[PDB]
Structure formats: structure tokens, C-alpha cells
Amino acid sequence: NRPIGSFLFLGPTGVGKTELCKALANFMFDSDEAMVRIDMSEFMEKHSVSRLVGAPPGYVGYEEGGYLTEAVRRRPYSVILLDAVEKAHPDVFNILLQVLDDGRLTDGQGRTVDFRNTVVIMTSNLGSDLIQERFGELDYAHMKELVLGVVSHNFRPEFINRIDEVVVFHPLGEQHIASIAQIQLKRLYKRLEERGYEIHISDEALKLLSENGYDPVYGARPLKRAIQQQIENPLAQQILSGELVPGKVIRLEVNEDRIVAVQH
Amino acid sequence: QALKKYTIDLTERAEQGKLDPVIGRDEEIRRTIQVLQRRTKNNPVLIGEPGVGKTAIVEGLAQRIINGEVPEGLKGRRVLALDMGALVAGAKYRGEFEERLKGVLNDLAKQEGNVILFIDALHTMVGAGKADGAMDAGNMLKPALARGELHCVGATTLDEYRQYIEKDAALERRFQKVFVAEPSVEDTIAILRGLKERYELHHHVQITDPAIVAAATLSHRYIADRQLPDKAIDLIDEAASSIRMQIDSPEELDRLDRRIIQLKLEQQALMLDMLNEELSDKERQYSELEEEWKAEKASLSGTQTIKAELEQAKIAIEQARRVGDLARMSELQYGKIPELEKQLEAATQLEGKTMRLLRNKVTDAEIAEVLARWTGIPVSRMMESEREKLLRMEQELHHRVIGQNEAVDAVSNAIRRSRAGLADPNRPIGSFLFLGPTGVGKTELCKALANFMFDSDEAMVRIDMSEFMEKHSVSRLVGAPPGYVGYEEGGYLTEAVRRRPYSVILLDAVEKAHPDVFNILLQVLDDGRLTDGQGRTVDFRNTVVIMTSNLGSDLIQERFGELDYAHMKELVLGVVSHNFRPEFINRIDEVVVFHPLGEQHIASIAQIQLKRLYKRLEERGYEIHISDEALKLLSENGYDPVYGARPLKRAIQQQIENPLAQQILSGELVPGKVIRLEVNEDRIVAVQH
Amino acid sequence: QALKKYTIDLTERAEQGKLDPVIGRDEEIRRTIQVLQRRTKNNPVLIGEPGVGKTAIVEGLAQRIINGEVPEGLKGRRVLALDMGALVAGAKYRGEFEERLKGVLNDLAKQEGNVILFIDALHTMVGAGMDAGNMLKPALARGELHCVGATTLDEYRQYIEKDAALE
Amino acid sequence: DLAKQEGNVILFIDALHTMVGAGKADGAMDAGNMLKPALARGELHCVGATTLDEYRQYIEKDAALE
Ligand SMILES: Nc1ncnc2c1ncn2[C@@H]1O[C@H](COP(=O)(O)OP(=O)(O)OP(O)(O)=S)[C@@H](O)[C@H]1O
Ligand SMILES: Nc1ncnc2c1ncn2[C@@H]1O[C@H](COP(=O)(O)OP(=O)(O)OP(O)(O)=S)[C@@H](O)[C@H]1O
Ligand SMILES: Nc1ncnc2c1ncn2[C@@H]1O[C@H](COP(=O)(O)OP(=O)(O)OP(O)(O)=S)[C@@H](O)[C@H]1O
Ligand SMILES: Nc1ncnc2c1ncn2[C@@H]1O[C@H](COP(=O)(O)OP(=O)(O)OP(O)(O)=S)[C@@H](O)[C@H]1O
């Protein structure tokens, strides 16, 4: 009688929340863009209720339903992402009270689309102050309790009765970000091998990127745009010369203060 | 017999071999055959978004029956294409459609369960005979399908299944769903690898497999309108059409023919000569190029005829596999396959020798031509002028934007990565924040970027945030939900990008709005997807989002001196941390800061205004020079760092345009005269010499 | 012979010089010829406000066929135009529009891949009574018809984005 | 007979919209679609007469009848 699992993730941004959800979808179907993603930060007024569940009889777009009950009448085993849900108009969640109580849903035309094989995931980012304040020297449990009280300030007490487990994230350490950088260089090797260039890297350049992209306060995206600038710009610079012969081992080796490529 | 009067044997057309061979699809065709051989409800329906080959699934069914790859219970079946266009035809008298239809019913009951009924657009049959107080085929196929002596096979679009058949619940549960899946990218690759030879039989040309896999990759990433594999099919066919018409065209022959008609008109006007000889040489060159064109056409024609005979050999040896002739098998194989393969490869390398003027094979460059023309994504491999133009992006910017090198370098890096193709396929291309004082060329920078990319100034969806100073304006720009008023229209920005896929978006004056207008921006910079009111996504990955605010401008003019760039960006980034939400400023690519202008740049800007002024007035047709003392005095009269460049602009505007157009329409300023913009004692004078 | 009942041999008219020697527009004519020599999806539509002479563009194409400027799939074809209002206006009862429509398709298959069709008012063909697009669905899909559209951009975004087979 | 005179006879028929959108016949045609050839055959220099509204209803919507 309840859907499979209904989780409220927390944290500061850029730590992997959306990636956990997309990792689930890219596991469960081998696709990021086969899921249901309702961008809940749009819902700053009380209308988009009537875009997700449909508009009642005697109104405009009647015979095409909401967005949610369409594609969960279609594919009964999906995994919903409701990202950034803390910026909705704070009573859009009563729709979600039905959704997480039983996972039937009274739509426009009346047909109770049934959710109970579809993972509701909510991902907020309320955990800025509290997690950046006291993730050090605290356990998982008291953090969960205290930010749970914080969300009780924000949401309704009606609501977190429903949520299956409110798992709370932590900011990243440096070695984590080095592994992130490993993954980013793997996807770069992916994007450039499709274009056709064998590229290696100085392993020291990993450490220079660790010196580059690290800050504990913004999550993993500073690493990403540091990779963007301080790798791609000399790379796509020298590519557009016609300089880089395909087939050569393009080892990304460090400069004195930068990273350079070789053609050997 | 009433059967051929309204139906079409598909297995007839399979024996014709006109049909697409269907590759992949073991799972749904096995599933459809399982739903065919039941006791009751002999009624599979094919459901999925259009283009995914639902017609081809039944066609591949018929091909596997004729080829005999089915279970034994179907060996002997007859798939028939029932036709609503046959059945509705002349039913103007009462009880005429129903008479025809029940004739079909009883004659398929005659067939002793050896016939499979195929209908496309089953919703059309549901609303087929539904006249005002009559009987349709819906309430006539209600009995013959709950018993299921009539082995129906359905085909529908997903939305109109929902509107049309699910209105009628009894004929909803007569049928079993088969949810036909969106085929994968790699399955699409395989299907395109199979469908090559039929297309080459059509377009008389050849196709290269990297262009095939590139067609799959490009069509899957950049379009969002149609669905796989159909859009890839259309790319391939469209490139083959362009190549066929390049073959039967050529452009050097066009230049030589325009040259010989120009020299012929000149020679007839002259009737010293020499032009009889020049015209004879050019017409001989044109005739040799034309004869080369005809030789290439004859060569590719013979190559295509023998490739067509190869494909007929493939069809004939499959007919020998079904029928079972003895000498035909080894004869067709060991004779017809290796000699036609080796001389078809000999004709292919002969083409590679003789094709000089034109092209013959389908290459990825042709595919990317079709894709760039087809919607507007700048895909193709770089020619020299555009690529070296891109390498000198910074130079072209400072052809129009003196000063503020930071943003020049930033956007230059952005678009070099874009046309380089190293962007993130889950983020848009450009995502920037501009912070500077009032009037320092930010808007004109972005306008020049548009004019670089597009040769157009305002083909950019400038959406000014200054209007948006309460919360509703998100629902201005993205749409309004169903039920309320703005559902019928759709949003503004979302239709802007769905119209022009590859654009440059500005969010000017982005200090003005309430701080929660920045949530659509979060979704945009998250995935490049945006869902408007009607409930569909719109691709923003091939776009560029740009914001221009003026937050720390007081601190900029205060402390651009005695600071580097790093502490500048650090302190003003903290200033944005005062203003905006930190959840947002993670998303931004670079937040460049704009220093106030220096007087040298101000003089350069004045030079730019003189250049565009000379441009517009030479369009008017005037030859205008200047005493540079007037430039110096205009520079001296229009300097204020607190207000930016536009005071110089209005000073130029007034103190130049007023005496100018004051004396133009007087007839004083005559075109063709040297117009020296000299000075008055405190003003500007122009002379006519 | 519904071709005698509903169609106009424009090749006859320009063959007798009845028509405009239409000037220019050669890039678009060429892209239409590109579309008209495909294997599938063999139907161009023409998007523009009425009075820009899309009719005349097809007319100039027909004059080029009279000239024989075409590639080797079009030499010998006969371009014939058709209205939908000539078909809708005779619908007293059920099944009278559609006998005409299928007899049209019987003449089209009867000429055996030799006739290029023109139809303007494509957005009209959306609504006639299912009614019209579904009977033309196989011949539009299976290469056995070479329909040429003519409509306006507003009617394109209003009508033709609805039926995907119509797209 | 119009082909016999070749534009010598200049006919008049008022209420063109009536002659287009009301001539219903069973297994038979109207005057509208049988004389719509004479539109694009030049044997028809005919004159009409209507009201402001019905012209816009049944005449301006067709291309040839425009
Ligand atoms: N642990 C991680 N593993 C892999 N990639 C990561 C990880 N953390 C961040 N990233 C990358 O950085 C991006 C930011 O992660 P997100 O989860 O999208 O941000 P967030 O933490 O969800 O906060 P929001 O959703 O943006 S409010 C991801 O899309 C990945 O590209
Ligand atoms: N796996 C496949 N094998 C063979 N042909 C295929 C395959 N997938 C797609 N096609 C071809 O792609 C085209 C599109 O498929 P269609 O069946 O025509 O689309 P559809 O199933 O008819 O759906 P709609 O609504 O009619 S577009 C046809 O020409 C098919 O032959
Ligand atoms: N380096 C430059 N090269 C060329 N023109 C420049 C340069 N710097 C400033 N300008 C001019 O400065 C004028 C004012 O700048 P704008 O971008 O129009 O105003 P702004 O910079 O957007 O600031 P606000 O907030 O709009 S007042 C423009 O007309 C530019 O032509
Ligand atoms: N390339 C061209 N050369 C000469 N005249 C042209 C050309 N293109 C269009 N025209 C003129 O445009 C006029 C418009 O007439 P129509 O063909 O009826 O207009 P249309 O562009 O077809 O749109 P509608 O729906 O038919 S009003 C024709 O009479 C032509 O003379």
C-alpha cells in the first residue's frame, strides 16, 4: 500500500544527489533520460499542481491530463525525481501526501493511476548551514535528528511522517574529489575517443587539479569547471589548429603552472 | 471473392520483396506471436510513439512467416491488410458499411483460422462507422474478438490510443497491449547497418559506415522532434538525395557556362578580336568537363545496375532457400556472389579513380550538411575560413569590442569548445554572469557575439529581467499551467528555443527581479531541459545563457585600482553571496568583472562610432573625412567614469547628427564630395570639397 | 476517370504556354526536387503566407519539366494538382467523400508511379469528418504517391503538429 | 457551348457561395466543382454577386476561388 521507497535527501549542492538518482536510472534502465523528473522549483505558485495532476473537467487542457499521471499510467516502474522541492510553494506537498500515503492519485479524468512500483525520491538542498556547521565531530544520527528538526521547521509535521528514510549528505574530502576527477577524465576520454584522439595524462596533473578544484564549500562543480577551463581550453585550442594528429599518444603533461599536451 | 475487394495480402508483397527487412526485434515479435496463438483474445495491439516501426513489426512478422522462422502453428498463415479506406467507401445507404464488414467477418470465419488480420490506426476503425445513430465497426467487432475468431493485429500512436480507444472500454480490453520500446542508439546503428543496401538501390550511390554511426550519434543528440530510427533514416536518405542531384547537376560547369555566355555576349557586342579563340578554348574546356561528367555518370550507372543485380541475386537465393531447388543454390552462390563482389569492388575503385569533379559516397560531412541545414545546429567539420575565423575569435571581438579582455577570452574559450565539441552533453554550452558598471558594452558584447555566430545582431532572445519584479513572471516566460489562461499558447522562452534550437539567450538587468526568479535558471543550467506548461521538455544544451548585472559596480569603480583580478573576483563573488543564493552560483561558468573604461578605449569607441557612421552614410552615399581635433574634443567633452560610455554616445549623437542632417537635406551636402568634419570654435563643421 | 473529374494537367497548360514563366526561387525548387526523389517520405510541403506564389513555384517546376532540367527520375512524369474542397463539398451521407478519395488513389496506382501530385490547403485536409489523412496514410508512407503541400506557418503549427503521420 | 463561343458569352450567375456550398447531388455533381475547371480554363469570364459575409464564408477560403 505504499510506494517502494520515498526518500528525502539533503545537503549542500553539488555533492551527488541528482547523480545518485541518475545513477539509479542509468542502472535500472541504462538511461538517465528514462525516469520522471518533476522540476519542483518551478512550482512557486499554486497552479502547477494543476499541471502535474491535470486540469479538471470544464477547463482548458482537459483531455491530456497532468504530466505525472500520463507517464506513470504508461510506464508503471519508473523512478521519480522531484528535485529542489524546498522552493515549491510550501503547500504543493499535499498532492504528495496522497502520493506517499498510498500512491494512487485522483487525476483529472478520474482514473486512479497507481504509483506503488515507482520510487519517489525527493532531493532538497536545505542542508547548507547545519551540515557545513557541524558535520565535523558529529555522528550520522544526531545530524539526522537536528536537520530533521530543521525540515520540521520548514515543511509540515504531516509530511515527514510519510517519508521512508531521510538520508542526509556530507561535504566531500579531497581524495573523494580526486576520484571524481578520475571519473571526469574517464568521460573526457569517452567524448574525445568518439572524435578519435588517444589521450593520456600526467598523474601529477591529477594532484595539480586537486590543488585547483578543491574547496569544501561548493561541492564538486568547482572541480568540474576547473577541469573545463584548465584542461579543455588549451586542449580545444590546440585541436582547432589542425595540430593534433589523430593516433598520437596525447599525454596531458604538466607545465610549470599549467597542463600541456604532447604529439608523440 | 469479397476478400480481395477490401483487403490486401501482405505476404503477396513479401513475395514481391518490396518491404524493409526488419532487424532486431526478436522480443516483441515473439511476444506478438504468443498473443496471436491464444484460445481467446487473438488481439495484439502495437503501442508506441510514432516512427518506431510498428508497421514494420508486422511487416517483419510477414517476412518471418514467408521465410518460415515461426513456430509450426503459424506455418501456413495469411496476414491481410484490412483497409478502412476500402470499407467506408460508398456506404451512403443505411446498412451498407455493416454489410461489407460482416461479409468480411463471415468470410474470415470461412478461412478456418488460418488468416491473421492486420489493421493500422485501430482508433480510426473505432470511429469508422460511428454515424449519428448508426453502427460502427466497434460494436460489430465487440463479439468477434471476445471470442476471438478474428485474429486482429493493432497499430497506434500512444496519445491517440489514450484519447480514442480508451474512451471505449469494451474494445479497450478486447486487445492486449504490446508496449513497443523506443529502440536504443546501438540497435538503431544495427538497423541502419541493415537498411543500407535498399537505399543504395534507390539513390544509385554508396554509403560509408562511419557516416552511418555518426548519423546515429548526431540524430540522437541534437534533434528532439522525431524519434529513432526514423530521423536517422531521414538524414541518410536526404544526404543521398543531395548527392544524387550533385551528380546530375556541376559548379565548375556552371562557371564555365556563365563564362562562355558572357564572352559570347561580349563578342557579339564587339561585332582586335581574340575572343573567338578564348571562347573556343573555354567551350572546349567546358566540353571536356562535361564529357568527364558523362563518363562518371555512365560509370556509376553501370556500377549501380550490377549492384542491383547482386541484390536480386540475394533475393533469388533466398527464394531458392524457401522453395528448395538443388542446382540453384550452389549455382547462384558460387557463381553470382564472388564475381559480382569482385567486379563491384573493381567498379568502386574505378569510381574512386574517375570521380574528380564530384563525389559519390555518403560521408559524414554530407550528413552534417543535412543536419545543419535541416534545423540549425552548427555541426559540420570545419572548413578553413570558419575555423581560422574561430581561431581569431578574440581579434574579431576587438574589431568591435575594445577593452574588457576577460570576457573576450571567456566567450572565445566557450565557443571554441562548442564548435570543438567538447561540451558536456548534460549542460548547455555557455553559462555566464557579467558584473560591471552602467554602460560598458556588455549588451553590445553579446550582440557582437550573436553577430559572430549568426551574422545577425538581434537574432537572440533577449528576455529582460527588469520587467520581472514579482513572482508571476516565471509564469510569463515558461508558460501557464492547464486550466488557467495561458495553456493554449505555451510559454515564451520555451517556444523561442523550440523554434530556434541554437540561440544565444540574454537575461539582462538580472539584479532587478525577486530572488526566486532564478529557479528556471537552475533547471536550465542543471540539464538543459525545461518543461513548459504543456508538459514536454525543451532542449537547451545547444544554447548559451548570459546574465548582465551591475551589483558590485560601486566596488568595481572603487577598487579596480590597487587590486589584481583574483581578489576582485573573490570579493565580488562574496557580494553575489550576499545577494543571490549559493545554490545558484555554483552553476555559473565564469563570472567576469568589468573594469571602468580608460580614455584610450573611449577614443577607440569614438572611432568605432565614426566607422559605423561612415558605414551608414556611405550606405547613404557620402564620402566623409574628419579633422581628428574634433575627435579629440569630443573625447574631452564626453568623459565620465561614473556613467560609462553612453554620455559619449549622446554627445556624438547630438553634436554630430544635428548639423549633419541639418545640412544634408538642404542640398548643401552633395554625395561624392569630400566631407571633412572640421571644427567650429566650440562645435563641428563639415565642408563640401 | 476522377483525374478528368478533379485534377489539372499543368504540364498541358505550360506545354501550351498558358502559364507564367516563373522567375527565380531556384534553391527552393532544387530542394523540392531533392525531396521528390527520395525513397520514403516523398512529400514536400510549402510553408509561406498565401500570395507568395507557392502555386507558381510548382508551376515553374512544371515548366522546368517541360524544359527537362530535371534529374533522371522525373523525365516523363505528369504533375497534377488537386483541392480538398472539391472532395469535402459532396458529403451528403457517410461514405461519399471517401469513395472519391479511394478512386483517386486507384487512378494514382493505375498510372503506376508516373504522376506527381499537388495538393494545397493541407490544413484543410486535417478536418473533413477518420476523414482524410488516414486514407492517404499508406500512399504517403509507401512511396506510391508524391504529394506536394502548400500552406501557411500558422496553420502548420496549428494543424500539422497534431497527427504525426501528417507530420 | 462556352467552349464553342470561347469567351464570347459573358455569363452572369449571382450567389457564388450558394452555387458552391449548396448544390448537393446524389451520385452526381454540382455546378461549382464542374465549373471550377472553367476557372482554370479561361472559358468563363463570368460575374458574381453576393453579400459581405457569405463571400468570406464560402469563397475566400478556397485558393482557386480566391
Ligand atoms: N559524488 C559524485 N559522483 C559523481 N559526480 C558527481 C558527484 N558529486 C557531484 N558530481 C557531479 O557534479 C554535479 C553536481 O551534482 P548534483 O547532485 O547535480 O548537485 P546536487 O548536489 O544535486 O545539488 P542540486 O541538485 O544541484 S540543488 C553532478 O551532476 C555530477 O556531474
Ligand atoms: N527495425 C526496423 N527494421 C526495419 N525497418 C525499420 C525498423 N525500424 C524502423 N524501420 C523503418 O522506419 C520507418 C518508420 O516506421 P513506421 O512503422 O513507418 O512507423 P510507424 O510504425 O508506421 O508509426 P507511425 O505512427 O505510422 S510513423 C519505416 O519505413 C520502417 O520500415
Ligand atoms: N570595448 C568596447 N568596445 C565597443 N563599444 C564599447 C566598449 N565598451 C563599451 N562600449 C559601448 O558602451 C555602450 C554602453 O554599453 P551597454 O552594454 O550598451 O550598456 P551596458 O554595458 O549593458 O550597461 P547597462 O547596465 O546596460 S547601462 C555600448 O553602446 C557599447 O558600444
Ligand atoms: N518566382 C516567381 N516569379 C514570378 N512571379 C512569381 C514568383 N513567385 C511568385 N510569383 C507571383 O506570386 C503570385 C501569387 O499567386 P499565387 O500563386 O496564387 O500565390 P501563392 O504564392 O501560390 O499563395 P496562394 O495560396 O496561391 S494565394 C503569382 O501570380 C506569381 O506571379
Numbering used by the authors:
A (entry chain C): 595 to 858
B (entry chain B): 159 to 407, 409 to 430, 441 to 858
C (entry chain A): 159 to 287, 293 to 330
D (entry chain F): 265 to 330
Source paper text:
We studied the disaggregase ClpB, which contains tandem ATPase domains (AAA1, AAA2) and shifts between low and high ATPase and threading activities. ClpB is composed of tandem AAA domains (AAA1, AAA2), an N-terminal domain (NTD), and a coiled-coil regulatory M-domain, which forms a repressive belt surrounding the AAA1 ring (Carroni et al., 2014, Heuck et al., 2016, Oguchi et al., 2012). ClpB activation requires two signals: (1) interaction with the Hsp70 partner chaperone and (2) binding to substrate protein (Lee et al., 2013, Oguchi et al., 2012, Rosenzweig et al., 2013, Seyffer et al., 2012). Each AAA domain extends a flexible pore loop bearing a conserved aromatic residue, in most cases a tyrosine, which interacts with the backbone of the threading polypeptide.
Three-dimensional (3D) classification revealed three states with different conformations at the seam and maps were refined to resolutions of 4–6 Å. These states were termed WT-1, WT-2A, and WT-2B and populated to 15%, 43%, and 20%, respectively. WT-1 and WT-2A are largely similar to states KC-1 and KC-2A of ClpB-K476C, whereas WT-2B is reminiscent of ClpB-K476C state 2B. Although we observe activation and inactivation events (WT-2B: AAA1E activation, AAA2B inactivation) in ClpB-WT, these are not coupled within the same ring but between the rings, indicating differences in ring allostery between ClpB-WT and ClpB-K476C. Thus, inactivation of AAA2B in state WT-2B is not coupled to AAA2F activation as seen in ClpB-K476C (state KC-3) but to activation of AAA1E. Furthermore, subunit activation (AAA1E) in the AAA1 ring and subunit inactivation (AAA2B) in the AAA2 ring occur simultaneously in ClpB-WT rather than offset, as observed for ClpB-K476C. Activation of AAA2F, involving the dramatic rotation of AAA2F (44.5° upon conversion from KC-2 to KC-3), is not seen in ClpB-WT. As a result, the AAA2F pore loop remains at a lower position in WT-2B (11.7 Å upward movement) and does not move to the top of the spiral track as in KC-3 (33.8 Å upward movement). In all three ClpB-WT states all M-domains are fully visible and enclose the AAA1 ring, in agreement with previous findings (Deville et al., 2017). They adopt a horizontal “repressed” conformation, with head-to-tail contacts around the ring.
